[PDB]
Amino acid sequence: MLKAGVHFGHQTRYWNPKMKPFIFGARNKVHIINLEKTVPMFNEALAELNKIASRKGKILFVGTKRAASEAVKDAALSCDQFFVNHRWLGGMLTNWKTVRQSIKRLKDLETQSQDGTFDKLTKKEALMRTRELEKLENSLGGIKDMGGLPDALFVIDADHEHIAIKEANNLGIPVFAIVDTNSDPDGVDFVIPGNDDAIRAVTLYLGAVAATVREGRS
Amino acid sequence: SMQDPIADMLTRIRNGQAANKAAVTMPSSKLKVAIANVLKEEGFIEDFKVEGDTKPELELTLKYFQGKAVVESIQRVSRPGLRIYKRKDELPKVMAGLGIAVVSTSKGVMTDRAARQAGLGGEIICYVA
Amino acid sequence: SLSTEATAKIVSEFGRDANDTGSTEVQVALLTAQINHLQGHFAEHKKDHHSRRGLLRMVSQRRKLLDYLKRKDVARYTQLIERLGLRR
RNA sequence: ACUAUGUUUGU
RNA sequence: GUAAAGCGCACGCAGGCGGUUUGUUAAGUCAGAUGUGAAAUCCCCGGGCUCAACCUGGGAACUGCAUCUGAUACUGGCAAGCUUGAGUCUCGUAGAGGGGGGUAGAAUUCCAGGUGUAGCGGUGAAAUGCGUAGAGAUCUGGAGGAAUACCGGUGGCGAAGGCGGCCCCCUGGACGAAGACUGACGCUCAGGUGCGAAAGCGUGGGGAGCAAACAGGAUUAGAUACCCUGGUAGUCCACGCCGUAAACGAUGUCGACUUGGAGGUUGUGCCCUUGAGGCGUGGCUUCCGGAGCUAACGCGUUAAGUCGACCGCCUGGGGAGUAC
Numbered sequence: 001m002l003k004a005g006v007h008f009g010h011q012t013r014y015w016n017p018k019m020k021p022f023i024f025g026a027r028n029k030v031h032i033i034n035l036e037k038t039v040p041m042f043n044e045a046l047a048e049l050n051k052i053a054s055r056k057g058k059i060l061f062v063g064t065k066r067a068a069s070e071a072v073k074d075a076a077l078s079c080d081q082f083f084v085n086h087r088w089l090g091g092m093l094t095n096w097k098t099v100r101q102s103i104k105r106l107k108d109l110e111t112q113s114q115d116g117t118f119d120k121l122t123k124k125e126a127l128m129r130t131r132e133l134e135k136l137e138n139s140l141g142g143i144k145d146m147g148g149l150p151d152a153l154f155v156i157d158a159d160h161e162h163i164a165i166k167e168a169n170n171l172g173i174p175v176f177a178i179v180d181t182n183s184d185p186d187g188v189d190f191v192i193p194g195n196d197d198a199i200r201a202v203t204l205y206l207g208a209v210a211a212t213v214r215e216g217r218s
Numbered sequence: 219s220m221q222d223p224i225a226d227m228l229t230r231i232r233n234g235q236a237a238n239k240a241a242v243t244m245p246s247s248k249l250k251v252a253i254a255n256v257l258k259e260e261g262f263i264e265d266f267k268v269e270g271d272t273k274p275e276l277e278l279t280l281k282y283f284q285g286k287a288v289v290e291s292i293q294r295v296s297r298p299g300l301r302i303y304k305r306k307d308e309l310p311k312v313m314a315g316l317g318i319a320v321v322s323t324s325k326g327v328m329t330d331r332a333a334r335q336a337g338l339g340g341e342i343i344c345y346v347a
Numbered sequence: 348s349l350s351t352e353a354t355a356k357i358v359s360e361f362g363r364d365a366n367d368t369g370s371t372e373v374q375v376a377l378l379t380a381q382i383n384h385l386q387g388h389f390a391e392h393k394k395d396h397h398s399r400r401g402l403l404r405m406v407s408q409r410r411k412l413l414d415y416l417k418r419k420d421v422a423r424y425t426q427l428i429e430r431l432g433l434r435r
Numbered sequence: 436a437c438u439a440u441g442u443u444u445g446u
Numbered sequence: 447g448u449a450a451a452g453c454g455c456a457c458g459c460a461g462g463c464g465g466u467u468u469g470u471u472a473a474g475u476c477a478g479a480u481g482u483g484a485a486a487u488c489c490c491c492g493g494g495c496u497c498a499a500c501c502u503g504g505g506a507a508c509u510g511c512a513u514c515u516g517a518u519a520c521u522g523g524c525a526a527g528c529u530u531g532a533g534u535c536u537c538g539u540a541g542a543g544g545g546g547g548g549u550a551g552a553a554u555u556c557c558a559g560g561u562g563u564a565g566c567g568g569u570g571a572a573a574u575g576c577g578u579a580g581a582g583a584u585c586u587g588g589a590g591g592a593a594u595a596c597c598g599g600u601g602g603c604g605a606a607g608g609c610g611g612c613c614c615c616c617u618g619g620a621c622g623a624a625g626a627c628u629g630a631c632g633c634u635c636a637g638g639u640g641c642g643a644a645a646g647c648g649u650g651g652g653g654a655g656c657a658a659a660c661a662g663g664a665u666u667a668g669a670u671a672c673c674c675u676g677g678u679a680g681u682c683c684a685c686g687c688c689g690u691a692a693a694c695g696a697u698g699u700c701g702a703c704u705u706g707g708a709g710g711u712u713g714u715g716c717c718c719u720u721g722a723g724g725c726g727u728g729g730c731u732u733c734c735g736g737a738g739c740u741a742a743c744g745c746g747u748u749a750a751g752u753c754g755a756c757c758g759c760c761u762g763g764g765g766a767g768u769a770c
C-alpha cells in the first residue's frame with residue numbers, strides 16, 4: 001500500500017469510461033482508484049524506469065500545473081534528470097530540430113548574462129534580452145542539457161499534458177503517466193492510476209520515481 | 219423481429235469483440251452450440267457454457283491476442299432471406315485458408331476444411347477470418 | 348370499456364377456470380364483446396376516427412386469433428364462431 | 436422608408 | 447439525412463421471412479453411381495501442309511438434365527410440445543388522444559345612450575379614410591362571432607396529419623408493479639382499404655376579427671407589389687368531396703447487440719423516507735460526446751455503428767412528374 005489516504009479520484013461525471021478497471025466503487029459522486037491495482041502497475045513502472053536508467057537513459061518529468069511545477073522541478077534535479085514544469089511547447093519532441101535552436105539561444109544568453117556582454121550595451125535592449133532570458137529559461141530550463149530526444153517521459157496528468165504524450169507516442173518514447181479517473185490510458189505505455197493534482201500524491205510519485213532512477217544510475 | 223438467431227449470435231460476437239468484452243451471453247440453441255463448438259476447436263473463442271435449464275443461456279468467452287480481438291471478421295453467409303448451399307468441390311476458402319467457413323453438412327456442423335476431408339457439401343453458415 | 352364484471356363473466360363462461368384468461372376463446376370473446384359494445388358508440392360518433400383505430404385494432408386481433416384457432420383445431424373454431432355469432 | 440442595371444469571348 | 451432515391455401515415459390479404467425441444471419424412475440440400483449432355487467449336491498434348499493461317503489424332507471440357515441408392519446438420523412438410531417473442535386478465539398512473547354537449551372571462555367590432563370636444567387615424571413622410579350631421583377619448587347597457595392571455599415548459603398525448611379556457615357524457619391508446627393464463631398465435635407487406643395540414647369544391651347555416659380578389663391613397667422611371675385606408679370569397683359550424691404540403695428527423699417498419707455524461711417527463715422497489723433524500727429499476731423524451739461510420743457536414747444505445755427480415759424507391763442534367 002504505502003500510499004493510501006492521500007489520493008482520491010475525480011467526480012463521477014468527469015470519469016473516462018476507459019478508467020473503469022482501475023476504479024473501485026465511487027463513494028459519494030467521487031471516484032475511488034483501486035489502490036490494490038495501483039501498487040503492481042506503479043511498481044512495474046518504477047521497475048521499467050530503473051531499467052532504462054540502467055541503460056543510461058534520459059527521463060523527462062512533465063508536470064505543468066502550478067500545484068506540481070516546483071515538485072517536478074526539484075525531483076528531476078534531485079535525480080539529475082530533465083523536466084518540463086511550465087507550459088509544454090507543442091513540438092518539444094516532434095519539432096526538436098527547431099526547439100534545439102531555441103535552447104542554443106538560451107544557453108548563449110546564459111553565458112552573456114553571467115559572464116558575457118550584458119551590461120556593456122544599451123540598457124533598454126539589455127533588459128530586453130534579460131526579460132527574454134527567463135521567458136526562454138522558464139520554458140526550456142529543464143531541458144537545456146538534453147542533447148537529443150529523451151528515452152522516457154514521466155507525466156503527472158495524462159489528459160492535461162496530452163500533447164506531450166502523443167508527441168512521445170508517435171516518436172516511440174515510452175510514457176509513464178499518473179492517469180487519473182478522468183483521463184484516457186491509451187497513449188500511456190505504463191499506466192499508473194492515482195491523483196494527478198493532490199500535492200501529497202504528486203510528491204509521493206515524484207519521490208518514488210526520483211529514487212528509482214537514482215538506483216538505476218549505479 | 220428476430221428471424222435469424224444465428225446472425226444474432228455472430229453479431230454478439232462481433233460487437234463483443236469490438237467492445238473488448240470478456241464474455242457474450244445469448245439465448246441458447248443446439249445449432250448455436252454446434253457453431254460455438256466449431257469456433258472453440260478452431261481457436262476463435264476460449265470457451266463456452268450452456269447454463270440454464272428451460273431457457274438456456276449460451277455464453278461464450280471471447281479471445282484476445284496482443285490487445286486485439288482474435289475474430290477480425292465474422293460474417294453470416296446463408297441468411298434466411300437467401301440460403302447458400304455449396305457442393306464439396308465448390309466449398310469456400312476463407313482468407314485463402316487462414317480463415318474458416320462453418321458448414322452444416324449431413325454429418326454435422328464442421329469447418330470447410332473438415333467438410334472437404336469428409337467429402338461433403340452443405341449450408342455455408344458463416345465466414346470466420 | 349368492458350368493465351371488470353363483464354370481463355370476469357366472459358372468461359368464466361368461455362374459459363376452463365377463472366384464471367384461464369389467456370385462452371384463444373376467451374381472447375376472441377373479450378374482443379367480440381368490446382367490438383359489439385363499441386358498435387353503439389360509433390353509430391352516434393361517426394367522426395371519432397381516433398377511437399375507430401382502436402376498434403379496428405380489436406377487429407384485426409380477433410381475426411388473427413381466429414385464424415390461429417382455425418389452423419390449430421377447427422372443431423373449437425367452429426364451436427366458437429357459432430357461439431359468438433361470427434362469419435359476417 | 437424605398438433605386439435598377441453592368442454586351443461577347445481568351446490566354 | 448443533405449448528392450437521384452423512405453410511399454404523408456396506418457391496417458392488412460396474397461407473398462417473403464420466422465423463437466425453442468423432440469420425433470418422423472426426405473421436398474430443398476449433400477454424397478455416390480449410372481444414363482445422357484451430336485459432331486464440329488473452345489482448351490491441352492501431339493501430327494501434316496517449307497512456317498503460319500489452315501487441316502487433323504487423342505484427351506479434357508460440355509460447369510446441365512434425368513434416374514437410382516444413400517446421408518439427415520440446416521431449411522421445408524407432418525405430429526407433439528416448451529417458454530423467452532406475441533397476446534389476455536387483475537391493480538394503478540400520466541396525458542392539448544378522439545367524438546358530442548354545456549359554460550366562463552378578457553378583448554375586438556357593432557347598436558343605443560351619457561359626458562365632452564376638435565381633431566382622430568395612419569406613415570419614413572404623407573394621403574386616402576373617419577370627424578362639428580359630435581369623431582377620437584371616456585362611461586353605461588345590449589347583440590354577435592371567433593379564439594382561449596397567464597399556466598406553458600427542446601412539457602405532454604396521438605400512426606401520421608394534428609391536439610391546449612373550464613365542466614359533463616361517450617370513447618381510443620400508452621405505461622408501470624406483481625402474478626396468473628394462451629402457447630409462435632410473430633415480423634413485413636405488392637395489390638386493397640382507411641386516416642390524412644392548409645388551400646380549394648358542393649349543400650345549408652354563420653360572419654366579430656383577419657383577409658386572397660378588388661378599390662382608393664401613397665411610393666416609384668414604371669409599381670398589376672412591398673406600406674396605408676377599406677374590403678369580397680375564405681377563415682367558423684354541419685354534412686359530403688378533394689387527397690395534396692419543405693405531409694421533414696428531408697432518416698420505412700420490426701428485432702437484436704455495442705463505452706459514457708448532463709437533464710426533462712411519467713411510474714415503481716428497497717433504504718437513514720429522517721423532509722422534496724440515497725441506492726436501483728421501467729416507459730417516453732433533450733443536449734453533448736466515445737468507438738464505429740460518413741465525401742464531409744455530422745450521426746453516435748432515440749445511430750447515419752454492428753447485423754437480420756420484409757417493403758418502398760434511385761440509375762446524369764434538362765425535356766418532365768410533362769404528354770398520351
Ligand SMILES: CN[C@@H]1[C@@H](O[C@H]2O[C@H](CO)[C@@H](N)[C@H](O)[C@H]2O)O[C@H]2C[C@@H](N)[C@@H](O[C@H]3[C@H](O)[C@@H](O)[C@H](N)C[C@@H]3N)O[C@@H]2[C@@H]1O
Nearest residue numbers: 447448694695696697731732733743744745746748749750
Ligand atoms: C434525437 N435524435 C434527433 C432526431 O430526432 C428525431 O427522431 C426521434 C425519433 O425518436 C424523435 N423522437 C424526434 O422528435 C425527432 O426530432 O432528429 C434529428 C434531425 C437531424 N436533422 C439532426 O439534426 C441535427 C443537425 O443535423 C445538426 O446540424 C445540428 N447541429 C444538431 C441537430 N440535432 O439530428 C437529429 C437527432 O438525430
Ligand SMILES: CN[C@@H]1[C@@H](O[C@H]2O[C@H](CO)[C@@H](N)[C@H](O)[C@H]2O)O[C@H]2C[C@@H](N)[C@@H](O[C@H]3[C@H](O)[C@@H](O)[C@H](N)C[C@@H]3N)O[C@@H]2[C@@H]1O
Nearest residue numbers: 709710711712713714715716719722723724725726727728
Ligand atoms: C430518489 N430520487 C428520485 C425518485 O424520487 C422518488 O424516489 C422514491 C421512489 O422510488 C421515493 N421514495 C422518493 O420519496 C421520491 O423522491 O424518483 C426517481 C424516478 C426515476 N424515473 C428516475 O428518474 C430520473 C432518471 O434518472 C431518468 O429518467 C432521467 N434522466 C432523470 C429522472 N429524474 O430517478 C428518480 C430518482 O430516483
Ligand SMILES: [Mg+2]
Nearest residue numbers: 439440441442
Ligand atoms: Mg435591361
Ligand SMILES: [Mg+2]
Nearest residue numbers: 448449450696
Ligand atoms: Mg436539393
Ligand SMILES: [Mg+2]
Nearest residue numbers: 448449450451
Ligand atoms: Mg435528394
Ligand SMILES: [Mg+2]
Nearest residue numbers: 452454455698
Ligand atoms: Mg416518412
Ligand SMILES: [Mg+2]
Nearest residue numbers: 456457458635
Ligand atoms: Mg401493418
Ligand SMILES: [Mg+2]
Nearest residue numbers: 459460461635
Ligand atoms: Mg400478408
Ligand SMILES: [Mg+2]
Nearest residue numbers: 221464465521
Ligand atoms: Mg426454425
Ligand SMILES: [Mg+2]
Nearest residue numbers: 472473474475
Ligand atoms: Mg432430396
Ligand SMILES: [Mg+2]
Nearest residue numbers: 493494495497
Ligand atoms: Mg507442325
Ligand SMILES: [Mg+2]
Nearest residue numbers: 505506507508
Ligand atoms: Mg471426355
Ligand SMILES: [Mg+2]
Nearest residue numbers: 484485486508
Ligand atoms: Mg460436344
Ligand SMILES: [Mg+2]
Nearest residue numbers: 518520521522
Ligand atoms: Mg428436418
Ligand SMILES: [Mg+2]
Nearest residue numbers: 470521522523
Ligand atoms: Mg423440422
Ligand SMILES: [Mg+2]
Nearest residue numbers: 527528628629
Ligand atoms: Mg398446453
